[PDB]
mmCIF file of C-alpha atoms and ligand atoms in Angstrom:
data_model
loop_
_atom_site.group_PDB
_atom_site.id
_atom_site.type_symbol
_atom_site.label_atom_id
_atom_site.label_comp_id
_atom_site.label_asym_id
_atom_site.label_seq_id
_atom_site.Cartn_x
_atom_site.Cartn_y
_atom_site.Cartn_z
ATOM 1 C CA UNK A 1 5.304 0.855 26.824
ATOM 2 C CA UNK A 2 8.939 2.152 26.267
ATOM 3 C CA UNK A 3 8.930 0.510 22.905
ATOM 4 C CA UNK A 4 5.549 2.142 22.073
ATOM 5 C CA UNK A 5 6.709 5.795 22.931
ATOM 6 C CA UNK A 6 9.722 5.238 21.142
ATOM 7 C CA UNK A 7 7.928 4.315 18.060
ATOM 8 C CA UNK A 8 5.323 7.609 19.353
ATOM 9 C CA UNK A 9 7.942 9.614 18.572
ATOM 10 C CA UNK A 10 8.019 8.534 14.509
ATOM 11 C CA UNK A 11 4.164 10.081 14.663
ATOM 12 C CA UNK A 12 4.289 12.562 11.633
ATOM 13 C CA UNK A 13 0.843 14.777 10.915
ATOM 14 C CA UNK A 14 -1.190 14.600 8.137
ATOM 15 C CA UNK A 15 -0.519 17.528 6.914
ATOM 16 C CA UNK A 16 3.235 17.143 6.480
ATOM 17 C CA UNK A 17 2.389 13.828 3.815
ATOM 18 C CA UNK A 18 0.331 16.627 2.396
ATOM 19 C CA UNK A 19 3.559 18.637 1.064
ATOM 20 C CA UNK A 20 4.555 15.559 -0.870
ATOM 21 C CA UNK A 21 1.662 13.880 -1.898
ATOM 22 C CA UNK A 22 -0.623 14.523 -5.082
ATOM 23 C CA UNK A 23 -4.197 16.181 -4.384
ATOM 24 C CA UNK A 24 -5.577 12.738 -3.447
ATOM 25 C CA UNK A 25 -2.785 12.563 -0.968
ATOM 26 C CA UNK A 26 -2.325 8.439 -2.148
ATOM 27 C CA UNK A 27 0.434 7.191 -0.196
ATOM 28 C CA UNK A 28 1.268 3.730 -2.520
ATOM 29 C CA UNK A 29 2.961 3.575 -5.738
ATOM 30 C CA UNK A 30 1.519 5.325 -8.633
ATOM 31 C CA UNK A 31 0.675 3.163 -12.712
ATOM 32 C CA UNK A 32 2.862 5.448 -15.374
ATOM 33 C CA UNK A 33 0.107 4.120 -18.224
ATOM 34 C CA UNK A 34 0.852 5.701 -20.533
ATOM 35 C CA UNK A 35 4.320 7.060 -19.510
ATOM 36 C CA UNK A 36 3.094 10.873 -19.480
ATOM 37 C CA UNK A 37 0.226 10.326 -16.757
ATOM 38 C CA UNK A 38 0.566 13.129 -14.054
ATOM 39 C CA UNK A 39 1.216 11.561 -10.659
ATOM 40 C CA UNK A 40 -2.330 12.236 -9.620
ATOM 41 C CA UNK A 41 -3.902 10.626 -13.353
ATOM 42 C CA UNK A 42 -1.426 7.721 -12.202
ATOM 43 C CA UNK A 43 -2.322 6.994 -8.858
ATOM 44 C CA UNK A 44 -6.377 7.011 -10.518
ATOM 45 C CA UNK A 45 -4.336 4.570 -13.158
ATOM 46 C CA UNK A 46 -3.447 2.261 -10.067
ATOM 47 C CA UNK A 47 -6.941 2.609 -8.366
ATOM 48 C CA UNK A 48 -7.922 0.857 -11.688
ATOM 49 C CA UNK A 49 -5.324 -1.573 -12.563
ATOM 50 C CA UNK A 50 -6.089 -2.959 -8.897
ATOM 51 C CA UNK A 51 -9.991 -3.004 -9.598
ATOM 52 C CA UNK A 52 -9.507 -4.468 -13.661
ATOM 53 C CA UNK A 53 -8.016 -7.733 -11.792
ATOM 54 C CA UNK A 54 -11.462 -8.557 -9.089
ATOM 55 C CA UNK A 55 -13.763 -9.602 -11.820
ATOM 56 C CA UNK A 56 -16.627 -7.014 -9.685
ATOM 57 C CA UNK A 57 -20.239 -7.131 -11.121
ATOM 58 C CA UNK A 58 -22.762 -5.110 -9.726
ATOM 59 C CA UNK A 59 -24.241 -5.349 -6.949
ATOM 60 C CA UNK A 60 -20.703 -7.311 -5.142
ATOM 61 C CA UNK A 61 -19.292 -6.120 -1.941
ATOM 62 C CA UNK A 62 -15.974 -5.135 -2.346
ATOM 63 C CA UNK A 63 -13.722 -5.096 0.658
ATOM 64 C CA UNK A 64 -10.781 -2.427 0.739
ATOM 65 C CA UNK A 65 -8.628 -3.755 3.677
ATOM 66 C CA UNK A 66 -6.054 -0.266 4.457
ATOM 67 C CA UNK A 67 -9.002 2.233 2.794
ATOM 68 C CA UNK A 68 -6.937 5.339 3.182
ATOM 69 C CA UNK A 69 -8.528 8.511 2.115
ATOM 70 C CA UNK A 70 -11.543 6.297 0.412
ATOM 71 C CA UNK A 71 -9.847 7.000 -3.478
ATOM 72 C CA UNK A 72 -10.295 3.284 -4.376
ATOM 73 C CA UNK A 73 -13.924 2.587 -2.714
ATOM 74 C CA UNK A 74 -15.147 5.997 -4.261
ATOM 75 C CA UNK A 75 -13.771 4.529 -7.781
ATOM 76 C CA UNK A 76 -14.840 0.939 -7.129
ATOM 77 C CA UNK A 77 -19.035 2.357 -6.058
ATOM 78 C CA UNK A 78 -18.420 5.191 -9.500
ATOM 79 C CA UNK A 79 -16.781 2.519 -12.043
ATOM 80 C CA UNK A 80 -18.353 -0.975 -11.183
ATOM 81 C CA UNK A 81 -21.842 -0.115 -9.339
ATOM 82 C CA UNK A 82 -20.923 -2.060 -5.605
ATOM 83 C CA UNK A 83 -21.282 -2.179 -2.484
ATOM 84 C CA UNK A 84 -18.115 -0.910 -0.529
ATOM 85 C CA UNK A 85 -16.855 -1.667 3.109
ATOM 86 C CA UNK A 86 -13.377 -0.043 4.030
ATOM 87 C CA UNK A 87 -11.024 -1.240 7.261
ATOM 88 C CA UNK A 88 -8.591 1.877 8.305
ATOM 89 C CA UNK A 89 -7.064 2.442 12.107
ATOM 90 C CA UNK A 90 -6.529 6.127 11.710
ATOM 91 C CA UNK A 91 -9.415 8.260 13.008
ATOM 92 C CA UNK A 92 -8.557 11.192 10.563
ATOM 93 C CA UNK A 93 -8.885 8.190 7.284
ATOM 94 C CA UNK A 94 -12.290 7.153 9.043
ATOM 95 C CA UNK A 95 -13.995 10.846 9.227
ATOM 96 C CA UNK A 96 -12.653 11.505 5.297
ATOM 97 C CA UNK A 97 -13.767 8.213 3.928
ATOM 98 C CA UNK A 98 -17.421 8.251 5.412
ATOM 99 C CA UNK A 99 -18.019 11.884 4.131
ATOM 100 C CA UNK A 100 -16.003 10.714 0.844
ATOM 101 C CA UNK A 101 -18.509 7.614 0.490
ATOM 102 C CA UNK A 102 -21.914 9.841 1.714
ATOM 103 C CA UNK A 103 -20.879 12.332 -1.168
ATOM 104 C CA UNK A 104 -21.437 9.634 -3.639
ATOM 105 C CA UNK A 105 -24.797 9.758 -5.483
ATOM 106 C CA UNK A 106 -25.619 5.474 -5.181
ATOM 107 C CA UNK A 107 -27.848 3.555 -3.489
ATOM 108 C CA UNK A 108 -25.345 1.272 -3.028
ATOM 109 C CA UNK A 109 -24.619 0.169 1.180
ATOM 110 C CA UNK A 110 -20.774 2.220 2.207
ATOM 111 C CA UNK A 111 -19.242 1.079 5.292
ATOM 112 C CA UNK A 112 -15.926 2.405 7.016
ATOM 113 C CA UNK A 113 -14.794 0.585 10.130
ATOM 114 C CA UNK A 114 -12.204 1.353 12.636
ATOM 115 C CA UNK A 115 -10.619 -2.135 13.285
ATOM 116 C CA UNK A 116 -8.121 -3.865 11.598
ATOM 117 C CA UNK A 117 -9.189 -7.162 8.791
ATOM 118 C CA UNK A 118 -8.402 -9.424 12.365
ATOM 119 C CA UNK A 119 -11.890 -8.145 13.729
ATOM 120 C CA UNK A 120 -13.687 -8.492 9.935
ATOM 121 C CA UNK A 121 -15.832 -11.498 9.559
ATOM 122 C CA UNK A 122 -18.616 -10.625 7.586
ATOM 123 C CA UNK A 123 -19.038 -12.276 3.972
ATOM 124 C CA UNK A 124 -17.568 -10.404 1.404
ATOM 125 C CA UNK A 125 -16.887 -10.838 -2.949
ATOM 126 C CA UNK A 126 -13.654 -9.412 -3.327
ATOM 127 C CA UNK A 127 -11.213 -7.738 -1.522
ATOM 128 C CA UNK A 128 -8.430 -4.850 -2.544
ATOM 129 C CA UNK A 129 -5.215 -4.430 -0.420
ATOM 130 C CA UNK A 130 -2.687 -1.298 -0.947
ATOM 131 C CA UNK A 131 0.346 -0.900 0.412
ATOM 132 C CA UNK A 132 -1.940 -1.587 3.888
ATOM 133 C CA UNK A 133 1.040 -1.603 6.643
ATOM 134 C CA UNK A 134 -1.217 -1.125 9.287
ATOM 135 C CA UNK A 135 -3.011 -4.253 7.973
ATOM 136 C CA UNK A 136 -0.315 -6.447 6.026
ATOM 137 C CA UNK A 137 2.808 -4.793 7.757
ATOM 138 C CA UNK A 138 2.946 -7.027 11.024
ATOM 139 C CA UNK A 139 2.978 -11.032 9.453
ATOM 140 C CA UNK A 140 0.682 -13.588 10.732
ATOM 141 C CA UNK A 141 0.456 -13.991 7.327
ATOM 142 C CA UNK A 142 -1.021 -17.584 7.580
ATOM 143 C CA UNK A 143 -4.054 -16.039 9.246
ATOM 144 C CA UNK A 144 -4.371 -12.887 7.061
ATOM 145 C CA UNK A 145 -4.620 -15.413 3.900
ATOM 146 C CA UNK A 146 -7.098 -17.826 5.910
ATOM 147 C CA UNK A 147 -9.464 -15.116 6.813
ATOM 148 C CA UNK A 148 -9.399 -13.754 3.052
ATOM 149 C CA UNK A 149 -10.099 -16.950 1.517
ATOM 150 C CA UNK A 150 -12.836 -17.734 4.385
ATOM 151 C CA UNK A 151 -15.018 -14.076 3.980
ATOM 152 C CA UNK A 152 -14.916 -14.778 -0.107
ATOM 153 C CA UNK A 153 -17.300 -16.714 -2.283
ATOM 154 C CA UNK A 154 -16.413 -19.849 -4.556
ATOM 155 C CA UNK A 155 -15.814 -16.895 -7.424
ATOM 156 C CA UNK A 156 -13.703 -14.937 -5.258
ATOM 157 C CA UNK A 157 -10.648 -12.811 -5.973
ATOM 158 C CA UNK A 158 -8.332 -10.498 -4.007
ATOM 159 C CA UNK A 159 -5.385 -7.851 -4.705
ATOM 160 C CA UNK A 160 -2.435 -7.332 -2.759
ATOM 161 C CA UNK A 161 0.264 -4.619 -3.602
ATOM 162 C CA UNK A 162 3.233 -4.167 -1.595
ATOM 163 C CA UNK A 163 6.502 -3.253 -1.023
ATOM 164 C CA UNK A 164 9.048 -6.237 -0.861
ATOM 165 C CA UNK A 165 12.251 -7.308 0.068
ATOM 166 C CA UNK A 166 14.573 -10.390 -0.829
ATOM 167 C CA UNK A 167 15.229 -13.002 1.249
ATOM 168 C CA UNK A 168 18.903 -12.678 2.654
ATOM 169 C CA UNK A 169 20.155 -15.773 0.610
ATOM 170 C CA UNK A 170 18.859 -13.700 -2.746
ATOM 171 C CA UNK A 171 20.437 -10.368 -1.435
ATOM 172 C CA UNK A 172 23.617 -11.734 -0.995
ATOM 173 C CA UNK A 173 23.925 -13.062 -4.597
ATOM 174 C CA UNK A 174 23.545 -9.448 -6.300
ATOM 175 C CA UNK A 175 26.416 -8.318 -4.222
ATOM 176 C CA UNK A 176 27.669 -9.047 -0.220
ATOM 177 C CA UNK A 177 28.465 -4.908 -0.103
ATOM 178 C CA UNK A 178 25.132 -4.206 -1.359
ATOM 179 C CA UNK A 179 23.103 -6.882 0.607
ATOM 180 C CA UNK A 180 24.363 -4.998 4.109
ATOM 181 C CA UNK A 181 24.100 -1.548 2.898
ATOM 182 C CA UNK A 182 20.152 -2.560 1.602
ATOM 183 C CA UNK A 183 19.382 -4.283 5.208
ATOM 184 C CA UNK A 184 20.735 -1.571 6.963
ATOM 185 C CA UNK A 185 18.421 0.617 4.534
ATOM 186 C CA UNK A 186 15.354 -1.495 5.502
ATOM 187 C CA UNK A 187 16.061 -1.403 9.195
ATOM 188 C CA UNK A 188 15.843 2.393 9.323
ATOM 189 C CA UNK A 189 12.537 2.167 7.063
ATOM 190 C CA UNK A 190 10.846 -0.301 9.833
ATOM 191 C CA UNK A 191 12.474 1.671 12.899
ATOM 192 C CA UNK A 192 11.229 5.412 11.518
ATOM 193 C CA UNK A 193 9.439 5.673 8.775
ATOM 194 C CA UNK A 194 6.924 2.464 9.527
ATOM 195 C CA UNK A 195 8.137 1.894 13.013
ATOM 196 C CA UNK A 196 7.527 -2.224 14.040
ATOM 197 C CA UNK A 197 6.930 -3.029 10.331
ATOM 198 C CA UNK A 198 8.299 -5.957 8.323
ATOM 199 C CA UNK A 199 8.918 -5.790 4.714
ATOM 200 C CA UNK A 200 7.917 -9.180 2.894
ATOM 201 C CA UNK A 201 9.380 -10.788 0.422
ATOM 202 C CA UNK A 202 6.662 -11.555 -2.567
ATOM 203 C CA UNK A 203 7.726 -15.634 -2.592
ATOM 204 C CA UNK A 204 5.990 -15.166 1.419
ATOM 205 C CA UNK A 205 3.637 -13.425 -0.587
ATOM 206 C CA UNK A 206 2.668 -16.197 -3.114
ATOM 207 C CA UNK A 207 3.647 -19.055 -0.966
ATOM 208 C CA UNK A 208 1.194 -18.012 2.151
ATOM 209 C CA UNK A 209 -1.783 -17.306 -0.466
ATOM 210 C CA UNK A 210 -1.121 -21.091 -2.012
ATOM 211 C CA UNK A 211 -1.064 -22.522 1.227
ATOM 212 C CA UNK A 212 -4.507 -20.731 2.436
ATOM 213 C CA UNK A 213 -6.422 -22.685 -1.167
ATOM 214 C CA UNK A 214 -5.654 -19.344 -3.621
ATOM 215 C CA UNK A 215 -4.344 -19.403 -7.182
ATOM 216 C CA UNK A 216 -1.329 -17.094 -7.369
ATOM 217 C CA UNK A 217 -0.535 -16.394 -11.065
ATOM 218 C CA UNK A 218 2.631 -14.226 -11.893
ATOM 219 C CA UNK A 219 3.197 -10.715 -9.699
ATOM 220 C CA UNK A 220 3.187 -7.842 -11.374
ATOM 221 C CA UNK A 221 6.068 -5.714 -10.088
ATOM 222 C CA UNK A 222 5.861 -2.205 -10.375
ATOM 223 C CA UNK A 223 9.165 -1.434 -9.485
ATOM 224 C CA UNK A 224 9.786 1.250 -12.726
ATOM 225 C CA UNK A 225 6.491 2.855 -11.768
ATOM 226 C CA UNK A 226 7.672 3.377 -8.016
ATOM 227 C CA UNK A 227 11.071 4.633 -9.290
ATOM 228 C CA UNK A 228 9.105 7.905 -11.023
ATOM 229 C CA UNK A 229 6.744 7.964 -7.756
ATOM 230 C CA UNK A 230 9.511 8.568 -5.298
ATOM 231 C CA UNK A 231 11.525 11.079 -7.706
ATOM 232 C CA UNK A 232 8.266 13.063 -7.851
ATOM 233 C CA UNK A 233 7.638 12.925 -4.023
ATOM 234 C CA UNK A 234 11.254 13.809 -3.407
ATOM 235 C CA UNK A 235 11.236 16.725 -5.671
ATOM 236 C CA UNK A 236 8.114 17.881 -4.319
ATOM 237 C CA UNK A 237 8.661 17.511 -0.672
ATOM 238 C CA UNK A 238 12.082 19.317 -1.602
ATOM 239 C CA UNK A 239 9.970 22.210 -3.331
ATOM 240 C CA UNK A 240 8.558 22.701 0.211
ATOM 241 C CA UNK A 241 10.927 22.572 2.369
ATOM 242 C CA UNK A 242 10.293 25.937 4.579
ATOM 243 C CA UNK A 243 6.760 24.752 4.387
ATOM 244 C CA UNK A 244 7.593 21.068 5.677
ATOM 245 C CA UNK A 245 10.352 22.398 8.336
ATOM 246 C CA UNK A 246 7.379 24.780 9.576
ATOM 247 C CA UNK A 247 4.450 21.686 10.106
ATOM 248 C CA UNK A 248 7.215 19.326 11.607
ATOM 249 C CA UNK A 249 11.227 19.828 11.980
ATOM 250 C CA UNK A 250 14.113 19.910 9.916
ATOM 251 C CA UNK A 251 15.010 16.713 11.548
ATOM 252 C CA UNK A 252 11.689 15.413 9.880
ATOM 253 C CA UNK A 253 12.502 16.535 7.004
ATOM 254 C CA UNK A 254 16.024 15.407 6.674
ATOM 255 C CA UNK A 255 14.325 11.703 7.490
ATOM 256 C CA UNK A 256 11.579 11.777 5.125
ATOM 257 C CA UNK A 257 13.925 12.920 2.331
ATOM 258 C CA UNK A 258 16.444 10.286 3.241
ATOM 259 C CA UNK A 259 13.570 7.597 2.674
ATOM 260 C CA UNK A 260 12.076 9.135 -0.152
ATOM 261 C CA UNK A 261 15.858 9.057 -2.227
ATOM 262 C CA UNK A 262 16.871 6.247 -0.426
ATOM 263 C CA UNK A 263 14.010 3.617 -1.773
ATOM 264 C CA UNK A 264 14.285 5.503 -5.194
ATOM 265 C CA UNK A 265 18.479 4.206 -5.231
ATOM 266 C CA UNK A 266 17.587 0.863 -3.906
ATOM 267 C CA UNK A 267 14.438 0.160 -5.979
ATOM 268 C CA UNK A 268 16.744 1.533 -8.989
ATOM 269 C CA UNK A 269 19.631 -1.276 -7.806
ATOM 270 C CA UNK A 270 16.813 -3.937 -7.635
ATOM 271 C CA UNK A 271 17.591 -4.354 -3.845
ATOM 272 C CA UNK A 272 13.587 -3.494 -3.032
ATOM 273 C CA UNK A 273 10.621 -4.454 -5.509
ATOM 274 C CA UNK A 274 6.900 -3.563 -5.609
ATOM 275 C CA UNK A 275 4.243 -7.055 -6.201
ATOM 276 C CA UNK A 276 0.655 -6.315 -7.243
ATOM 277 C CA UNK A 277 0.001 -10.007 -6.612
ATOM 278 C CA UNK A 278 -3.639 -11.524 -7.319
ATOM 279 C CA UNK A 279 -5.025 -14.474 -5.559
ATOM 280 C CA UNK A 280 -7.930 -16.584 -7.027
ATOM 281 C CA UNK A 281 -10.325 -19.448 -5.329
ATOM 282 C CA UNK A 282 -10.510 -22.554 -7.188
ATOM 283 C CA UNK A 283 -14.044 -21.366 -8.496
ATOM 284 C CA UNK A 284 -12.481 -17.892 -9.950
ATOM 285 C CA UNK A 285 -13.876 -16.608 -13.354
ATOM 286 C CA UNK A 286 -11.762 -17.861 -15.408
HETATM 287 C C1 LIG B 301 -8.084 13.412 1.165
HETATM 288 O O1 LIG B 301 -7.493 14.605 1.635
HETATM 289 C C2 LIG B 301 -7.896 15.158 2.825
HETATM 290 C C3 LIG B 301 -7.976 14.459 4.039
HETATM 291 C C4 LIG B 301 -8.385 15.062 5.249
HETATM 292 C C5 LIG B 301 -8.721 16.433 5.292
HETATM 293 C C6 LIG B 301 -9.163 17.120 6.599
HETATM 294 C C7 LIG B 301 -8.627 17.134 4.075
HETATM 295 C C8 LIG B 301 -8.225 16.572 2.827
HETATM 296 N N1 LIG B 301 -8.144 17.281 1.669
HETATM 297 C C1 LIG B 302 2.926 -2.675 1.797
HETATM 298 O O1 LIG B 302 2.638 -2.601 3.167
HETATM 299 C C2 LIG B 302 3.768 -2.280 3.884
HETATM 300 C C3 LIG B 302 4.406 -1.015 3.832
HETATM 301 C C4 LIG B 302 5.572 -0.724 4.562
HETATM 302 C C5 LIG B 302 6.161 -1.709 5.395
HETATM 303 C C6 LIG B 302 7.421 -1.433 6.206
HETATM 304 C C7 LIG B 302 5.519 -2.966 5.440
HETATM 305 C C8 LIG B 302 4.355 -3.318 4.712
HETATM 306 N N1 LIG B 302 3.763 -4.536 4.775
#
């Protein structure tokens, strides 16, 4: 209801993401590997470094839980010869990913469903997870982690990679000026920007992924690699400001470039991280 409208009014178009965005308009942190990657060749170096973890042989399903525009089924079907089923709530993600996925020349099956993983009960290999808020942005964590390890094979394997937080206790130690200034900071990211979301902390991460039977070696944080993703974003959306102004408002604007150099600052204090975490069954590769 009122809560719902108010939120409404944080709905931004596609088009303004667009003016920010690189051509595959990938809205997750980018791999700089090597360092001089272009932010487009780096979010295609992410795709992979996601995919190199999953252990996929042909002929697998992969699940992509938060499939986007369809850039990591498209690479998974190309790259490792599988079958592909993609979870998205946005309408406009759904139309692009099942024309994305009937461009492909395969045999392989290509699914895109409009539901969220809390509907998805069908047996799948693996399963990839970026930066999903519609999916991993709104806890129950306990059941997300149970369902997971339930749809997988005794071989099984699943990526996560998402923005974090610290627990206050850990926030307060790098500095009691800082810890406010970062919560107030993460407040107006879950109000505005992902309005009703919750930032985890990657120790939930881990600990809810032991607790559902998975293997949880060391997260990778990306945190450097995010750093260069939101000063590229930044300057870009910047560069188009008229343009941006035009599709939405300067009040738009002025929000999307106070989150954009905002998380750059706070990732670059080490107030907010980025975990690519992987979770193995017991009967994992090894
Ligand atoms: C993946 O980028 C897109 C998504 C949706 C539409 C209508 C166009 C493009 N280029
Ligand atoms: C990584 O997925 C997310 C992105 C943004 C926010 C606020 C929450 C989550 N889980």
């Amino acid at each position: 209801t009122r809560f719902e409208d108010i939120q409404a009014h944080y709905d931004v178009s596609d088009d303004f993401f667009a003016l920010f965005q690189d051509p595959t308009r990938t809205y997750s942190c980018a791999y700089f590997e090597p360092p001089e990657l272009t932010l487009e060749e780096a979010q295609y170096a992410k795709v992979d470094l996601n995919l190199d973890k999953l252990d996929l042989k042909p002929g697998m399903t992969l699940l992509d839980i938060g499939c986007g525009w369809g850039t990591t089924m498209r690479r998974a079907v190309e790259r490792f010869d599988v079958n592909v089923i993609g979870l998205t709530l946005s309408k406009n993600q759904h139309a692009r990913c099942e024309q994305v996925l009937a461009s492909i020349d395969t045999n392989r099956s290509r699914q895109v469903l409009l539901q969220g993983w809390e509907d998805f009960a069908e047996p799948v290999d693996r399963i990839v997870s970026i930066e999903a808020f519609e999916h991993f942005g709104h806890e129950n964590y306990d059941d997300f982690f149970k369902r997971c390890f339930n749809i997988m094979p005794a071989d099984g394997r699943m990526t996560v990679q998402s923005s974090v937080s610290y627990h206050p206790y850990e926030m307060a130690a790098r500095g009691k000026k800082l810890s406010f200034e970062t919560a107030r900071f993460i407040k107006f990211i879950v109000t505005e920007i992902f309005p009703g979301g919750r930032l985890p902390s990657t120790e939930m991460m881990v600990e809810h992924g032991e607790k559902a039977g998975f293997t949880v070696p060391e997260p990778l944080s990306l945190r450097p690699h995010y750093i260069k993703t939101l000063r590229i974003w930044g300057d870009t959306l910047q560069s188009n400001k008229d343009k941006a102004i035009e599709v939405t408002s300067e009040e738009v604007y002025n929000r999307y470039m106070k989150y954009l150099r905002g998380c750059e600052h706070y990732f670059t204090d080490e107030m907010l991280d980025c975990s690519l975490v992987t979770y193995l069954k017991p009967g994992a590769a090894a």
